[PDB]
């Protein structure tokens, strides 16, 4: 064999060089750093009004406005400081699994299992929220949708592909391929120039927005991936999976840095998020509790117990003044 | 201490809460039925007969039914079935015409899920105009050596039906509702209505403790 042999010997020698040049693990370097202690977070406020499971939730850029996607087909924009419902957008499809909040704050988006996170415009001269564009072209169910700008959105679906769109035209500028299983999560970099995507094929991979090529791929996993997020400097990311483990990779060293698992944990992870300073890692499990993981020590520094069902979506403010956690019990909770 | 504006914000929030409650109350009066089955198993024929993801809405005897067909998803990774909790039931379809073994495997998969323990399942064998003509070519032994019953329509059909029923690994919670009457007549609609009615009554009773 020549193509099989070439592929095998390549993969082998790249991985061997990566292992050899590896110096130490993240925990090995931060041993002299002390734990953060018990991160006791009380529910300062609770958002009520959803009448079904919560699948997704995204913070605004001003750190005061929320948006949450729910199984009942309602996208609600909250005012966190007062628990006011600023907007109530009736979605066309009741099967929603992800969304985002435009950085400018002008736009919010989605659809659902119809393979679209359709876009809504907030600041309209009619005073209501209207559907601006519907980005069609994906074939599999839709796993994420994140804004690069007010006129550029990147999307991840179950077709093993991610697409970069031009909202005004509505045509997918570029389409990304390489996955073999359903793509479940993507995270946009701070500079909106790169992003990482995770898929059911047990492999996360970094995809560039401009060239359209696959800059990198990540492996070292057992089961499918459900959640992914960048370290706040955009120089790393963490993953979450049904294996009941969360993994932190570095897109430069190409090697998995740390593992986030404990024996008592037997169920998967549905969402992941980071602290403003990237010192606390937040993951929403199926065990009805959300664990606060010290990203450098991997110990459980706290638990956001108080959810009566699966914790599906997390979030953090841009200023880090709070944490929003969603679950299937239809209640969002802002913690601090 | 509220300003003249924050009070109007609170009034907006209260109005939105009123709208949310009045729409959720409507959303809780609708029967949700997940539809499953293999290719050419009457799924399309059933959705036509019955009064990305595809939704079909119909009203029968004052009930609002939502039947969700998820046959478009070409990935076999069960990453959205858990979103179908709370559905009143399921409608799994199979055709007498080794397709039968694949259908049995899928039926076992749907019954054995942790997500559908409390949800009845409605197995359908609706068509009865082509289910007898082909029985005479060979008995139920092309891939099923065990069967040694009479090579007649009723006997073989009942044997297949009982073999499907036996797949239920826990009969305590759920129940399988079966149908064999011809698809031509408008009985397939009535059967699902009786099944959902029974499931609704049992859900109500199990809430009090009577069950």
């Amino acid at each position, epitope marked *: 064999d020549q193509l099989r042999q070439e592929a095998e010997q390549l993969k082998n020698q790249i991985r061997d060089a990566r292992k050899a040049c590896a110096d130490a693990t993240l925990s090995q370097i931060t041993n002299n750093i002390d734990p953060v202690g018990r991160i006791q977070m009380r529910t300062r406020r609770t958002l009520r009004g959803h009448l079904a499971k919560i699948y997704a939730m995204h913070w605004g850029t001003d750190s005061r406005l929320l948006v949450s996607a729910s199984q009942d087909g309602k996208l609600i924009i909250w005012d966190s400081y007062t628990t006011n419902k600023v907007h109530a957008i009736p979605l066309r499809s009741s099967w929603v699994m992800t969304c985002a909040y435009a950085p400018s704050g002008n736009y919010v988006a989605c659809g659902g299992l119809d393979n679209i996170c359709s876009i809504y415009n907030l600041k309209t001269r009619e*005073g209501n929220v209207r559907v601006s564009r519907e980005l069609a072209g994906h074939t599999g169910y839709l796993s994420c949708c994140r804004f690069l700008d007010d006129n550029q959105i990147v999307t991840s679906s179950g077709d093993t592909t991610c697409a970069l769109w031009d909202i005004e035209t509505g045509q997918q500028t570029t389409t990304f391929t390489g996955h073999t299983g359903d793509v479940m999560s993507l995270s946009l970099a701070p500079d909106t120039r790169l992003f990482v995507s995770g898929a059911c094929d047990a492999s996360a991979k970094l995809w560039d927005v401009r060239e359209g090529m696959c800059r990198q791929t990540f492996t070292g996993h057992e089961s499918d991936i459900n959640a992914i997020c960048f370290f706040p400097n955009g120089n790393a990311f963490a993953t979450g999976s049904d294996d009941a483990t969360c993994r932190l990779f570095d897109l430069r060293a190409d090697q998995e840095l740390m593992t986030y698992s404990h024996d008592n944990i037997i169920c998967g992870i549905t969402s992941v998020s980071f602290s403003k300073s990237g010192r606390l890692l937040l993951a929403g499990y199926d065990d009805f509790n959300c664990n606060v993981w010290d990203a450098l020590k991997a110990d459980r520094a706290g638990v956001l117990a108080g959810h009566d069902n699966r914790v599906s979506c997390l979030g953090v403010t841009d200023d880090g003044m709070a944490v929003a956690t969603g679950s299937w019990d239809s209640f969002l909770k802002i913690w601090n | 201490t509220l*300003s003249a504006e924050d009070k*109007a*914000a609170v*009034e907006r929030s209260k*109005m939105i809460d009123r709208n949310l409650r009045e729409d959720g109350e409507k959303a809780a009066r609708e029967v949700k039925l997940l539809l499953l089955g293999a290719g050419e198993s009457g799924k399309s024929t059933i959705v036509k007969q019955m009064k990305g993801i595809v939704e079909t809405h119909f009203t029968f005897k004052d009930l609002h039914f939502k039947m969700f067909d998820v046959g478009g998803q070409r990935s076999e990774r069960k990453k959205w079935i858990h979103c179908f909790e709370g559905v009143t039931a399921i409608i799994f379809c199979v055709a007498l015409s080794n397709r039968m073994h694949e259908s049995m495997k899928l039926f076992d998969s749907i019954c054995n899920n942790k997500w559908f323990t409390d949800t009845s399942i409605i197995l359908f064998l609706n068509k009865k105009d082509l289910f007898e003509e082909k029985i005479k070519k060979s008995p139920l032994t092309i891939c099923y050596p065990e069967y040694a019953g009479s090579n007649t329509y009723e006997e073989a059909a009942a044997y297949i039906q009982c073999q499907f029923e036996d797949l239920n690994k826990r009969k305590d919670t759920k129940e399988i509702y079966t149908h064999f009457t011809c698809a031509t007549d408008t009985k397939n609609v009535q059967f699902v209505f009786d099944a959902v009615t029974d499931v609704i009554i049992k859900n109500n009773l199990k809430d009090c403790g009577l069950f």
Partner: single-chain antibody
Framework: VQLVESGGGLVQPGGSRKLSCSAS????????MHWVRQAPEKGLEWVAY????????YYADTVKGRFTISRDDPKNTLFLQMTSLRSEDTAMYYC??????????????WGQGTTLTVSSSDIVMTQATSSVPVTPGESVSISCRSS???????????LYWFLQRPGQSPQLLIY???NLASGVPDRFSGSGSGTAFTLTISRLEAEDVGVYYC?????????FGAGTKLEL
């Protein structure tokens, strides 16, 4: 967005009429309505208010209990029924829309007004002057003072800036402080602190001539200023 009123004219003292305001071009049901009036070449004066859904109704101390504000969401129309008119009730009545939610501009749009003629505690804001000659390109600064401090505990200084051009109804420029509205050139700006407030304009143009009004929304009833003019 089009707010058009009607129902004005002439009326003797002690008579009754009904003003009407027809709104079209936006979600009227989600918008609360204000009523404002302006006496002949004297200035503005707030009148009434009805919140979204008819949940709250206020009135001006001048006409509280005499007058009424009515809503009809299905027909997208607004009413102001007037019971008994004194000789002071001559003025040009405006129809103003308002929606309150975090970040909103609650006085974005004004109507074209209507005229009514009759035969012959509260926060007080005073405007420094009523006329100021200036030429284009030479910066100006309009200002007015207030009795109380409009800075609420929310951190919001509920002071607005409307500019009434000759022969045209007022127009929002600033809705809390420096928060430029929709369709307004970026040259305008607003600033102040507690009681002293100023509106600044750089590189003035031919369309900046008119009367400037500063309105307060911290507590009801709302109160306008005398009105500062720019001479050209």
């Amino acid at each position: 967005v089009q707010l058009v009123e009607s129902g004005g004219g002439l009326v003797q003292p002690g008579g009754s009429r009904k003003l009407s305001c027809s709104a079209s071009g936006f979600a009227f049901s989600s918008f609360g309505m204000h009523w404002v009036r302006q006496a002949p070449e004297k200035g503005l004066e707030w009148v009434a208010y009805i919140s979204s859904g008819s949940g709250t109704i206020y009135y001006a101390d001048t006409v509280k209990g005499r007058f009424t504000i009515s809503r009809d969401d299905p027909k997208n129309t607004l009413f102001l029924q007037m019971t008994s008119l004194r000789s002071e009730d001559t003025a040009m009545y405006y129809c103003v829309r308002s929606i309150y939610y975090y970040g909103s501009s609650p006085f974005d749009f004004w109507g074209q007004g209507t005229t009514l003629t009759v035969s012959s505690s509260d926060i007080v804001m005073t405007q420094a002057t009523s006329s100021v000659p200036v030429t284009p390109g030479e910066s100006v600064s309009i200002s007015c003072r207030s009795s109380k401090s409009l800075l609420h505990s929310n951190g919001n200084t509920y002071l607005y800036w409307f500019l009434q051009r000759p022969g045209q109804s007022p127009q929002l420029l600033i809705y809390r402080m420096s928060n430029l509205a929709s369709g307004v050139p970026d040259r305008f700006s607003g600033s102040g602190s507690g009681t002293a407030f100023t509106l600044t304009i750089s590189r003035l143009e031919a369309e900046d001539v008119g009367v400037y009004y500063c309105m307060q929304h911290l507590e009801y009833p709302l109160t306008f200023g005398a009105g500062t003019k720019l001479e050209l």
